[PDB]
């Protein structure tokens, strides 16, 4: 019966957490210490990349660890050289309603999405002059919110629609999709191996799944309210991910339970975007207050700051060979540090 | 510093041009929210979609309603996009009353949003003939028994008003009510002296002038 | 992608000539355009240079002064306005496109050119003029510079050309590492200083010709001798 299901649901819950507790032996925190701490660190504008004039929402540093790409309400993504900070690229998006950007690990596709519902998927380094758009990915009733490449094929979205998906480029048809969460899917983050990939939503969850069959494996939740983005732990064994609660949590794959809480009574809105670093040891975050914020990932505390900008840092992001980090804000400048 | 970066240069440079050109042919636009709920006469002001953007040129002012329905999605996370428009018409038919209650939730949430915190808002009371029509027929005291009073046709849609500018506690928050005369093409004017007046406080409170 | 050519033939010495580069088929107004002529008998040397949106214009040596370039991207022209004709000036003009950015290959595509006959830096050394060989088995060309094209980048601006008999030249090997798209994987590139090397290994049918090696570091663009390949 119904009552007998609600009922079984109720036990499985009871077993997940009794397990989670009493695999908890003990928390990071009890053995982190005795380590050296990372110290105080200052982060200076190396480069200030000036152009856009819009809400700079998302960027993606691209496999090269030179180029990056920029998205906008200016109507138009924008694919930036960072060493010589000039603009390589001005693609006219079709939508000036752009949620997020990808940048292929190729560099020969970029992705853009946003609150039209379609993922465009423009061509570089073609016979023609001009980028043109590749493929358009129709199907997601809710609005696009993260969207990553595998491969030159083979594309993750998580739109408004509480569901995940996996494309076929070539086909433009979902190749798999995941249902399993409930509140709107705010960010996916592709796993190193590109084995497994998660995805944090409205719900205060974090869910992971596989690639090719695609059932939801592992579910995390501990956070206060939504999840705003998501990002691996470089060994792929791990990741971490901010919400508006004003904190971040680590969770681990091989163990449920979540390792760490970022939070401190400075901070009162959340946290917009999340990345981390070669060693994982520093995890970067924009926060509420126009600032970013980098927190030891082993110590839990705010190792290092950022210098303003003049709105929300909607996004940031670590280069592949960790040289250097880029933030990009509703400003409409972004910034490159080290 | 070679020929070819320095050609490179020179693209990033026409690249700069075009982008500036476009971010100047763009600034003459100005953004309007069009909100309201369901059967709200969205339709009306001009005369898996996730927005209905809609543009007309109007006295030297090329306006862009972003009439967005098709979200059914949570606001909370979507409406930051719409940050900087320049007035939100928040369209409510009259006529139906019902999604009265839900229509002034709506707008409690849309007018105190910290994101429109300073927004002005364009109200729309839509649907006046069919008000006026019906209201003679059910007195008001179905929606708001409290101080319904009579159900005189002005009487009513004043009570209504004063029920919508209420809701608003942002000191500098002018609510430009303009009591839509049913189906008839005057929208036009309205929302060029007002959004000319939201300009013009705009830039009266940006030279600190106070 | 065609950049067919127009405006060649029988002149007298001393008169004005105009040549037409009719562009299609790709975004001719993203694209910096070159002139490049050949002799009868000798190799490719440099003529004209425009960049993209008219913004910059370069002419050689012997080309400074006597000769003008102009862009039309309307009708997705290129002009070259021939003045004062010599008798050196005789040779074959090729229309080539380049678009400058990060990791882009300039010279990537050749027009088929048209002749031109007239009524009677950084030099390039190739220490070869023809070596025999076989189908089948690995070659290498050399290439000198007159001094080191390394530029304060990590890339070299070395380029490598083929030009099969009767055809016009194809892109090869750009910033002298970089293998040129729609091309065989068997060339390979490979170069330190000024010493050059473009290496085919598994040499097949349809590779006899005239390789060129042009540097690309400053104005002006020149050639090398071009060693010939047979057989």
């Known amino acids: 019966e119904l009552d007998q299901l609600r009922q079984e649901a109720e036990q499985l819950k009871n077993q997940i957490r009794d397990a989670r507790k009493a695999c908890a032996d003990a928390t990071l925190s009890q053995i982190t210490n005795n380590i050296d701490p990372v110290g105080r660190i200052q982060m200076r504008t190396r480069r200030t990349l000036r152009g856009h004039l819009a809400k700079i929402y998302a960027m993606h540093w691209g496999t090269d660890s030179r180029l990056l790409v920029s998205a906008s309400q200016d109507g138009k993504l924008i694919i930036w050289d960072s060493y010589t900070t000039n603009k390589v690229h001005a693609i006219p998006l079709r939508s000036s309603w752009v949620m997020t950007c990808a940048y292929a690990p190729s560099g020969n596709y970029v992705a853009c999405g946003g609150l039209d519902n379609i993922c465009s998927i423009y061509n570089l380094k073609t016979r023609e002059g001009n980028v043109r758009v590749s493929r358009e990915l129709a199907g997601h009733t809710g609005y696009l919110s993260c969207c990553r490449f595998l491969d030159d094929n083979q594309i993750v979205t998580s739109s408004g629609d509480t569901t995940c998906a996996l494309w076929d480029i070539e086909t433009g048809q979902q190749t798999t999709t995941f249902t399993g969460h409930t509140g709107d899917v705010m960010s996916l983050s592709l796993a190193p191996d590109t084995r497994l990939f998660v995805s944090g939503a409205c719900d205060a969850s974090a869910k992971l799944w596989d690639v090719r069959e695609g059932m939801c494996r592992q579910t995390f939740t501990g956070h206060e309210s939504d999840i705003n983005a998501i990002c691996f732990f470089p060994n792929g064994n791990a990741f971490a991910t901010g919400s508006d609660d004003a904190t971040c949590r680590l969770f681990d794959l091989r163990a449920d339970q979540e390792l760490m809480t970022y939070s401190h009574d400075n901070i009162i809105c959340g946290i917009t975007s999340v990345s981390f670093s070669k060693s994982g040891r520093l995890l970067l975050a924009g926060y509420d207050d126009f600032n970013c914020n980098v927190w030891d990932a082993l110590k839990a505390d705010r190792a290092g700051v950022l210098a303003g900008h003049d709105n929300r840092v909607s996004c940031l992001g670590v280069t592949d060979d960790g040289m250097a980090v880029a933030t990009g804000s509703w400003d409409s400048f972004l910034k490159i540090w080290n | 510093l070679s020929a070819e970066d320095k050609a490179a240069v020179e693209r990033s440079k026409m690249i700069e041009k075009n982008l500036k050109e476009d971010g100047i042919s763009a600034a003459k636009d100005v953004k309007l929210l069009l909100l309201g709920a369901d059967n709200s006469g969205k339709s009306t002001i001009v005369k898996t979609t996730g927005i209905v953007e809609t543009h007309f040129t109007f006295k030297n002012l090329h306006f862009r309603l972003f009439d967005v329905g098709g979200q059914r999605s949570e606001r909370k996370k979507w409406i930051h996009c719409f940050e900087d428009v320049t007035a939100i018409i928040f369209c409510v038919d009259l006529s139906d009353y019902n999604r009265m209650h839900e229509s002034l939730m709506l707008f409690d949430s849309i007018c105190n949003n910290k994101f429109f915190i300073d927004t002005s808002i364009i109200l729309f009371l839509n649907k006046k003939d069919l008000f006026g029509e019906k209201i003679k027929k059910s007195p008001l005291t179905i929606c708001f028994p409290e101080y319904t009073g009579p159900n005189t046709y002005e009487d009513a849609a004043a009570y209504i008003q004063a029920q919508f500018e209420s809701k608003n506690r942002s000191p500098n928050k002018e609510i430009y009510c303009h009591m839509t005369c049913a189906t008839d093409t005057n929208n036009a004017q309205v929302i060029f002296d007002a959004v000319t007046d939201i300009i013009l406080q705009m830039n009266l409170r940006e030279y600190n002038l106070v | 992608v065609q950049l067919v050519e127009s405006g060649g033939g029988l002149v007298q010495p001393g008169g004005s000539r105009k040549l037409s580069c009719s562009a299609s088929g790709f975004a001719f107004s993203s694209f910096g355009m070159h002139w490049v002529r050949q002799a009868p008998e000798k190799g490719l040397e440099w003529v004209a240079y425009?960049?993209?949106?008219?913004?910059?214009?370069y002419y050689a040596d012997t080309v400074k002064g006597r000769f003008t370039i102009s862009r039309d991207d309307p009708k997705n022209t290129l002009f070259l306005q021939m003045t004062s004709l010599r008798s050196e000036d005789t040779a074959m003009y090729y229309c080539?496109?380049?678009?400058?950015?990060?990791?882009?290959?300039?010279?990537?595509?050749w027009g088929q050119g048209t002749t031109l006959t007239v009524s009677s830096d950084i030099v390039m050394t190739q220490a070869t003029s023809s070596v025999p060989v076989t189908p089948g088995e690995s070659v290498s060309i050399s290439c000198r510079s007159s001094k080191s094209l390394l530029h304060s980048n990590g890339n070299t601006y070395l380029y490598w050309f083929l030009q099969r008999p009767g055809q016009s030249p194809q892109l090869l090997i750009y910033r002298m590492s970089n293998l040129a798209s729609g091309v065989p994987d068997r060339f390979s590139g490979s170069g330190s200083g000024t010493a050059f090397t473009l290496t085919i290994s598994r040499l097949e049918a349809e590779d006899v010709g005239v390789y060129y090696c042009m540097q690309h570091l400053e104005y002006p663009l020149t050639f090398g001798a071009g060693t010939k390949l047979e057989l």
């Open positions: 425009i960049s993209s949106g008219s913004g910059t214009i």
């Open positions: 080539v496109r380049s678009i400058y950015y990060y990791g882009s290959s300039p010279f990537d595509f």
